[PDB]
Write a protein that binds this ligand. Sequence first.
Ligand SMILES: *Cc1c(COP(=O)(O)O)cnc(C)c1O
Ligand SMILES: *Cc1c(COP(=O)(O)O)cnc(C)c1O
Lengths: 396, 396
Amino acid sequence: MFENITTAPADPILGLADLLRADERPGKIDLGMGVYNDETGKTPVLTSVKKAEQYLLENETTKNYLGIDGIPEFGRCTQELLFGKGSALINDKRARTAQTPGGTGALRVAADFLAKNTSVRRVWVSNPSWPNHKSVFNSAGLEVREYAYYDAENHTLDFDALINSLNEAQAGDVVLFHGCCHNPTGIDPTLEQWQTLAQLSVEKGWLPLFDFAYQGFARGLEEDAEGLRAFAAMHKELIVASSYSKNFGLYNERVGTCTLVAADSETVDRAFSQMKAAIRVNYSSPPAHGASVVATILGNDALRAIWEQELTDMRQRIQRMRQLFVNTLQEKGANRDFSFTIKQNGMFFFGGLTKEQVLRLREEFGVYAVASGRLNVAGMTPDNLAPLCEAIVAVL
Amino acid sequence: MFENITTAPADPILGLADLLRADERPGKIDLGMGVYNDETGKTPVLTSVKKAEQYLLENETTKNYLGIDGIPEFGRCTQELLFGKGSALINDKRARTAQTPGGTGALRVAADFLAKNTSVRRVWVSNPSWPNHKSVFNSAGLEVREYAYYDAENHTLDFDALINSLNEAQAGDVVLFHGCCHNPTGIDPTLEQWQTLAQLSVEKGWLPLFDFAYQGFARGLEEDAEGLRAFAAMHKELIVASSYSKNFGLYNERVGTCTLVAADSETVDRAFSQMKAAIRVNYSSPPAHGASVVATILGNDALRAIWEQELTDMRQRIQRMRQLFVNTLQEKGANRDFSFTIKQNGMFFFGGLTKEQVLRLREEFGVYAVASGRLNVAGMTPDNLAPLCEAIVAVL
Ligand SMILES: *Cc1c(COP(=O)(O)O)cnc(C)c1O
Ligand SMILES: *Cc1c(COP(=O)(O)O)cnc(C)c1O
């Protein structure tokens, strides 16, 4: 059976781990996949998380199955994080949330749900976008089309091009939006632009699908939810996929959610039953640990206080790092000005390097970054900043 | 979009949780889904597990992503549990194992892998079988056909009918086998019958797919692996899906594996790259916690000793319970003799009740069991045995 099977091409993000693993050079700088690193270059488990874990260790009395949608408390806490304490969706009971295996599992579940329960055929993804988006939707059988977003020249959001290209999007099409910290550009639409998109969306009849993987990394939990909320106020239906991998540093515990919003509770329930069926035939029920940790923290005011402060520290370190980054590039003699990097939200740097420039970086300097020219700023430390900037300047 | 969506029918196993949840009657007896209960009717977290968890709490220094296939140590430990310490497959490097979200995730990953990378169109499942088997394969696009297995009259394995029906299975077809403790019959083929199936399999050109969810619940870890090993000795290719939900009591942490066996390391590697691609587009990487707990136990001889003893206790309690069950039914005046139940391996009782008899049981007695007449013996306790037998006798 397996004689003619072809070797699958390496993942553009995950594939870096292996190349890196095989590179015996000591001064390796890993700026590839988007995980947070502290000043020492380690990606530690948050103190709020450890505390939640001791709590679980001491009070967990069973490991019995979780129920297709997972921990109820977890689902409710995420709904308020997303829609807000007194959201109409919560009080009208128009939203049903399922605990999933990470943000990716959330996208896969939505896709399987859509592909088999609605007439959705096309999904619109921004150009550029997280590489795995196309893959996830295509494996579900959906056609993926792109819409303009980034302006390589001005390093901004080309709003007109976006609007124009989305005019080809027909009613019933799914349009995928990054909630905040757009991966990989880091350019997000203003609240005003979000409001314009919301109304255009309702008018054209698109089915909004929000991908929220970095809530709290741009400005703050609530502020980062602004776009979605402007959308949640005018739409009858929505799908929201979120991740807690990054904002809770629980990458490998696979914590995420998939929320369905419908005109009313009766419809959301019928629709949700089909999403649970799509889950049962995939992984059955979600992993408890990571979500328990999230529900405990969010549910306990003391632990929540520590957590929110940890997130704040994470965001602030990245902000300081990208500023220092630009400054060091200046003193190292960088021919090109990288000031725009400062206007980018999240963990990444994008727009100043070419595919060949990044190949040369790993090739002779051992600096690893995504081939698209995307660098993980959250991976730069005061110690590696200088060697890093010297390599980049030698490449420009 | 969601206006015409139909309500999905409740799961035959998982659906019991909800009915049960809505039944306010106090003397409810839950003999539905297959989870272990101790003498007190609780499904506790094993002591070996708690200890592994404290270890992790104290020594885990990061939560960084796990890599598509998961924890390497975990993969190796499962290979020896399955194939044996000095298995040829291990030493010739013909097997590649991926950590998955439970046994169900293992079946789904294999199915997606098969559907898109080979010419597999049909999968043969026993009659009867775990209900979710058909669903998993159908959602991947594969046609599912059944083969005879159980003899409702004699309460045995109708080996000739099985052989006969499998003659319709063509080369290149996948044939699914339960490693041990066949769900729901509890009837497993003798080692001699396994050897006959292995040779017939090689001769006809079937692609064996083993589902191992109860290793250690029939006779012992090694003994329960006999069938698979007789198959692993003659086959060039195989697929094995296993679960640690039941034998480690880690139901909600979603711990399982999907192992690929090929003629050689070069082919298994090409094939495995495609399985990782199928994973990346599903949930990306597996949940660490549950598998870490399994790798720690299996990797530490002291913890392993405690664990193996806990499994032994679990198996022994079920054995005592089904014997006491038959005995109590005798003294309660059961018209029908249920001695055959004693020849069944695993957690279940199957073959003595009809769909209506089980409906009447929940209906007026509050005894919950699967509509197929499958009862979870591991859920019977000395306390509920009497009330349980009185209801059954009142129903016969
Ligand atoms: C990280 C990320 C994801 C993945 O979520 P996981 O929890 O890692 O599966 C999804 N979408 C975007 C945009 C991301 O950045
Ligand atoms: C329990 C069971 C499974 C499910 O494995 P999970 O770890 O619960 O997903 C798969 N197959 C059989 C036969 C089972 O009994």
